[PDB]
Amino acid sequence: DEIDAMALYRAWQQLDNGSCAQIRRVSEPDELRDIPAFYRLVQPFGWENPRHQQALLRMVFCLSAGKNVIRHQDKKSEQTTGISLGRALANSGRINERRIFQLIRADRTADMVQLRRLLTHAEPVLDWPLMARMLTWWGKRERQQLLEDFVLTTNKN
């Protein structure tokens, strides 16, 4: 029912350099639909179910920042979730607050483009399945929560 995020992650990690190269050339999420290698990548992960397509398009798009741009790290046994996207972006020390500002205010499509730029720039360390859920919904609530996590992190750290 729910999309496997970790599977897709590892899949993207072990992808052949040519396919990765072919996917890395999209400049917009929907362009992934122009690319054979993409469908081959997401076929095992429920692409054929319309419910999961938009979601998958985002996931891959962000991953398409690089083969190891998004470093996944498991959460600690103690805490209930791992590192959030905002927090990681803030932790990188390379992302300026106004970037997030203009991100959460961006139109559809544009936001994902911007996000991917931020990911290449930061090479964040985060709980990937968490980010994946976030991308799965990606609405007002989530954008806001992103900026909040960023702000509070940058505040303490």
């Binding site: 300026n96 106004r98 203009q102 205010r105 961006a106 139109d107 544009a110």
Partner: protein, 357 residues
């Protein structure tokens, strides 16, 4: 005859930042559920007030301040040839409600508008009152008699005639209440705007800077809808009972300025000196804005300008028919019951002539 005159402007700006807030981000507003970029009414006002067109076709502008010491010295300087120093000081005191020492720091209650012409007139009055050893509250009593005689002076302070003034202290509280004759709206864009950001640096000529964090400046371009109306009667009253012709004159200057003046912010580094591409003037018994023409935000097709102009025109047709608005209207446009005007000057003339030339 119609009491109200409506001025609509569609003007398109190249990338720029014509107004910002406490975080130096472009001022915005939500309309139709989408973000428009906004140029506030006060900004437009001050733009027109301090313009050179104003200075050459309307006259002197009010002087807004709170520093009665500085104002003291200024007033002494430009009135010293007509009045005694303490006639001047006295007048200042009676109008401000604060004692005019030779102190170098004297604070009013708030930043208020000072028309110099007005103050000169009050200086004549206070001179009179000084000759007859008259008590202040009685001078007040006399002056409350004929307020029109004081408003006649706002012909050397038209900007207050247009935008009004509220009074809180001194005889102004009784004599100074002006209700503005011009209503003016915050400029908003006819389309959704996602603002761009400029990421700049400063190269230090004495050290090869390496890693650095770049400064940010929000900016955007956009097609703005400006709207203002003028209540002719109230202008006439605010000017001391001036003729309709003089009102219409001032109105015409407001049209010109609303069609040409652009706030000064960051213009030295973004240069958005664009004239308006559409100006329509419309005489009416009840003021009405055309803002709802762009409530459904304009989507671009070969730009935002033309689609905006057409949105405007269509809503104008629908409202004119719907609410039966037979009033003199004229439209000036750069693009190929409303009288079309080839040049801005023809429009201006049309307005001067009460809308039938």
């Amino acid at each position: 005859m119609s009491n109200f005159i409506n001025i609509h402007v569609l003007i398109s700006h190249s990338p720029s930042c014509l107004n910002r807030d406490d975080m130096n981000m472009q001022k915005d507003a939500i309309f139709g559920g989408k973000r428009r970029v906004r140029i506030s009414s006060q900004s437009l006002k001050r733009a027109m007030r301090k313009s050179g067109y104003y200075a050459q076709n309307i006259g002197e502008s009010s002087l807004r301040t709170i520093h009665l010491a500085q104002l003291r010295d200024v007033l002494r300087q430009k009135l010293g040839e007509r009045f005694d120093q303490k006639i001047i000081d006295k007048t200042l005191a009676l109008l401000s409600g604060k004692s005019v020492d030779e102190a170098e720091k004297i604070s009013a209650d708030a930043v208020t508008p000072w028309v110099v012409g007005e103050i000169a007139w009050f200086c004549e009055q206070v001179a009179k009152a000084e000759a007859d050893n008259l008590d202040d509250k009685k001078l007040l009593k006399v002056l409350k008699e004929d307020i029109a005689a004081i408003r006649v002076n706002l012909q050397q302070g038209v900007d207050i005639a247009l935008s009004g003034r509220m009074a809180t202290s001194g005889m102004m509280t009784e004599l100074g209440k002006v209700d503005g004759a011009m209503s003016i709206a915050h400029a908003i864009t006819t389309h959704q705007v996602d603002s761009d950001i400029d990421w700049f640096t400063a190269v230090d000529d004495l050290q090869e800077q390496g890693s650095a964090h770049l400064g940010t400046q929000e900016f955007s371009s956009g097609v703005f809808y400006r709207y203002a109306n003028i209540n002719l009667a109230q202008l006439q009253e605010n000017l001391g009972g001036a003729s309709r012709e003089q009102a219409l004159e001032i109105a015409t200057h407001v049209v010109h300025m609303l069609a040409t003046e652009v706030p000064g912010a960051k213009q030295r580094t973004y240069a958005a000196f664009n004239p308006a591409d559409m100006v329509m003037v419309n005489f009416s018994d009840m003021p009405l804005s055309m803002a709802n023409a762009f409530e459904k935000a304009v989507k671009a097709k070969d730009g935002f300008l033309q689609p905006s102009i057409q949105a405007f025109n269509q809503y104008w047709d629908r409202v004119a028919n719907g609410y039966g608005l037979n009033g003199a209207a004229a439209q000036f446009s750069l693009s190929d019951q409303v009288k079309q005007m080839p040049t801005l000057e023809q429009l201006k003339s049309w307005v001067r002539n009460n809308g039938e030339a």
